[PDB]
Amino acid sequence: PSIKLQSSDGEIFEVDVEIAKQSVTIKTMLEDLDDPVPLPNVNAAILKKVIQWCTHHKPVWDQEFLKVDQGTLFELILAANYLDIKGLLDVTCKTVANMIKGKTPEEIRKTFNIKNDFTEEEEAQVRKENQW
């Protein structure tokens, strides 16, 4: 009952038979099918963080784990997409939604790396329909 997971950087980790089953990708791949399986997209130790989270969930601990920078959060979201883990994707989405909840519409343009792409008439019209 030994399964191996290989990241892009090439380092080999250890995953139990009941640890990787949280991700449905590995679940179905083992369901219908001694070697390292290379995952092209996941990089560095984000795989180790995913393993840590899936072992923890084998609230407050969510914020405790996710008290990280934007890049780590984005990498975790993409990892959740790759492995198709429902809980991790949901918790990352909720964390981002709280990160935008109670924020000024002017601030997001500066803080979430999006240059404003709109016309003055377009902005006036958008403000007009949003009167509700």
Binding site: V24, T25, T28, M29, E31, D32, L33, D35, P36, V37, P38, L39, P40, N41, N81, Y82, D84
Partner: protein
Amino acid sequence: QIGLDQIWDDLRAGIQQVYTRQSMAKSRYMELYTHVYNYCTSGAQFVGLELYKRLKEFLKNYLTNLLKDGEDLMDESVLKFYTQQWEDYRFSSKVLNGICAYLNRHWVRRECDEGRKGIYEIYSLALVTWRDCLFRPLNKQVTNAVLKLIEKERNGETINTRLISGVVQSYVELGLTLTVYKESFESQFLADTERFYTRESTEFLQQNPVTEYMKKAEARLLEEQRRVQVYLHESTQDELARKCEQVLIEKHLEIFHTEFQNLLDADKNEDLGRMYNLVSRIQDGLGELKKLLETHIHNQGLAAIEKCGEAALNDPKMYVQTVLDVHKKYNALVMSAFNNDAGFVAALDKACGRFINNNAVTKMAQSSSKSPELLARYCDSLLKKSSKNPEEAELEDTLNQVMVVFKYIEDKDVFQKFYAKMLAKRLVHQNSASDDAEASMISKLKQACGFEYTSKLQRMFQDIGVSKDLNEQFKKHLFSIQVLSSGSWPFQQTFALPSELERSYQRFTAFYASRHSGRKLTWLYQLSKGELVTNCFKNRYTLQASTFQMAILLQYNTEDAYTVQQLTDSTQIKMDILAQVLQILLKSKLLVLVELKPDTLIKLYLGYKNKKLRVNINVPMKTEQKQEQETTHKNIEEDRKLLIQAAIVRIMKMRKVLKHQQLLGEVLTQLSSRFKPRVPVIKKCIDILIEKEYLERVDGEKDTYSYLA
């Protein structure tokens, strides 16, 4: 990030590896998955539209190319080709569906909600592509080949059952449910089954006897159930069973009826049970069997009774035993073959009643009351001594069987009266085979009759017991006596008491006067018997005779010849009784003188020779029974009239005004436990009641009676 063209060349090669099943690399799976993921991530405006068309084209080409290989194959060839190709396609399709799970998670889900019905999941896409490409051209060949294989298996050969199971599974899964399975396989299956079983049944019945066809049919049905259990879908059970039952039994019921009659003529229990099991599965098909059974039992009973003829009229044992045997055989047949079915027991009961209450014996006697009388006489014959002590176990069974027969007799009053008379005669003369038999019969009569009759019988028993106790007590105070009550005994009461018993008579009269006051003893002499000691014979003779015979043999001591004109005055006996007893004496070979006149001379045969000293000259009188039968029948008729009149008054005293039909029905159901009255008797009783000012007819509304005080 990544365009479609950059990965499609590698993706085609990767998907080709999934098909043509081989060892699948543990890493090539993720290598193929990553290309799909990178392509799919580059109002919703999703991205995965273009890959679906290419996948559809690839599957189209693969299916057409593989179909080109096996377009012209034969039975085993098409079965194998289809089975392995189907397994490989299913496995590879599931793997491919796993590879492209991102599309299934997002793009097809989005297109399903919008309303586009042409988009499926990739596994369902593979199945629908198979159905559209390969299933259509080969379905007829595969179905016909499977049908031929099944037909071969039905004629006793051995086939590869795993081949059909794969085809059935493929048909069931291709209903994207049982739409395809019903319209592509079941129709042909059930169409060919009917023809095969029709020809098989006709050929089998043309040569083999009809009895073995039942075993053949039951084996066929069990085999069909097993086949559906082993290599067919479970949903076909009821349809196949119904079709087989139809084609095997419903057409041949017409000859099944004649077969049933023939197997009734000659006993065959297991075959009848098999027929009952077969025809039971047809709804409302058992009625003809019941009617034929009832008619057969009726005719058998009449034929068996008519065989005996004149002998059965005066031989109770034969008459009862014929009926008992006819009932017993068919009752065992009903218990065993037909598993205690209510309809069959009802038919047996109706037939038994019909041939018990009307047969050849009854026509000989011109009345329907001979059967209860013969049953009562048979009970009396059983319960007497009869030169051998019966075994307790055997007697109880006969009594139970008699009670069973008694249930089907409509005229129970005749049986009750005759049994009461015979029990009285048995108890007075003290000749009972066993007391346990009397007790058991009394208990059965308690269970299955009224309460007044039981009360009278119990009073008879109590009187005999107290008389025995009184005799035992009075023996010490000093021949036996039987003191009985007045109204509880059926005996209906001129005798010169001999001086030999005058002292005993006076002593017993004084004893009864001293013990009890105000009670007068009426002495019955024609039911009293004893013994004699004689002197002027060859030697010491001991004889058994009636008290009238006691007096008429003790009247002459030294004289021999007497003239019956003086003998009548001497003995104080009427004409007919004296003549009958004198004829009995002459018939005893113990006197010398058949027409009797008052001047006729009758002497004594001196030196009479007898083979045995123990002689019983008190033979039963032949004419007495024939004279008594008419009297008791007339008494029964009078009692019937009185009961009918009382019932009519009772029913009219609760309902003030009533019609004719309701009155007759109520009277019949009220008297149903004693006898079945005749309508003319009821009409005559009503007419008499109207005359005697008890009930009147209302003016108008004819055929209506009203109660009048």
